[PDB]
Amino acid sequence: GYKIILIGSSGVGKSSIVHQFLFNRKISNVSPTIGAAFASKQVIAKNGKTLKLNIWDTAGLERFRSITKMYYTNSLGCLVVFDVTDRESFDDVYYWINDLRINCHTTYYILVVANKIDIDKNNWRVSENEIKKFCRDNDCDYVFASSFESDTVNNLFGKMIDKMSEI
Numbered sequence: 001g002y003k004i005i006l007i008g009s010s011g012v013g014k015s016s017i018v019h020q021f022l023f024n025r026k027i028s029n030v031s032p033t034i035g036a037a038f039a040s041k042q043v044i045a046k047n048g049k050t051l052k053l054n055i056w057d058t059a060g061l062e063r064f065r066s067i068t069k070m071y072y073t074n075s076l077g078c079l080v081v082f083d084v085t086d087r088e089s090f091d092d093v094y095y096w097i098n099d100l101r102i103n104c105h106t107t108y109y110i111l112v113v114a115n116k117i118d119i120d121k122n123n124w125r126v127s128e129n130e131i132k133k134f135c136r137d138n139d140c141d142y143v144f145a146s147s148f149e150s151d152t153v154n155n156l157f158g159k160m161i162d163k164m165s166e167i
């Protein structure tokens with residue numbers, strides 16, 4: 001299988017994204033993550049291979065960082081999620097990626113997820129240009145999503161799946 005972790009500050013929607021990827025309904029059973037939670041899903045990649053995604057959904061709360069840190073190692077893909085209205089959550093992305101890289105040398109693809117795009121654009125606290133510029137400087141990709149819109153979750157996992165299939 002392919003180890004994928006979701007990291008990012010508390011409340012950005014990591015668990016909502018994972019539940020949407022796993023289940024085809026409205027999401028409703030979500031509380032803050034403490035210990036990392038595991039799920040697996042087998043998917044057909046564009047090259048026709050079946051890939052098993054081994055997914056760990058980790059805690060964003062600051063007091064639980066010493067749990068989340070124990071899940072970095074041996075990750076092949078990472079989704080780093082932030083909330084477009086939560087400026088601190090965006091500033092935190094740099095440090096999430098920095099910390100992952102201190103602890104893990106195996107990641108092949110880091111995808112920054114700008115989440116909660118359903119919120120009115122005039123309430124966003126980060127611009128598309130800032131997001132693109134950040135990623136251009138930090139050897140990572142970006143995508144825009146809303147946990148409540150399955151089309152955006154299918155898309156962001158599709159990008160991750162395509163990259164895993166290149167390994």
Ligand SMILES: Nc1nc2c(ncn2[C@@H]2O[C@H](COP(=O)(O)OP(=O)(O)OP(=O)(O)O)[C@@H](O)[C@H]2O)c(=O)[nH]1
Pocket residue numbers: 008009010011012013014015016017030031032033034058059060061115116117118119145146147148
């Ligand atoms: N408007 C909006 N709210 C969202 C979206 N995704 C998640 N939320 C809400 O944000 C809150 C936090 O979502 P979670 O999925 O628990 O966030 P998390 O990143 O897993 O948080 P931690 O486990 O504490 O790190 C919930 O009330 C969600 O319903 C989204 O795309 N748009």
Ligand SMILES: [Mg+2]
Pocket residue numbers: 014015016031032033057058059060
């Ligand atoms: Mg969570």
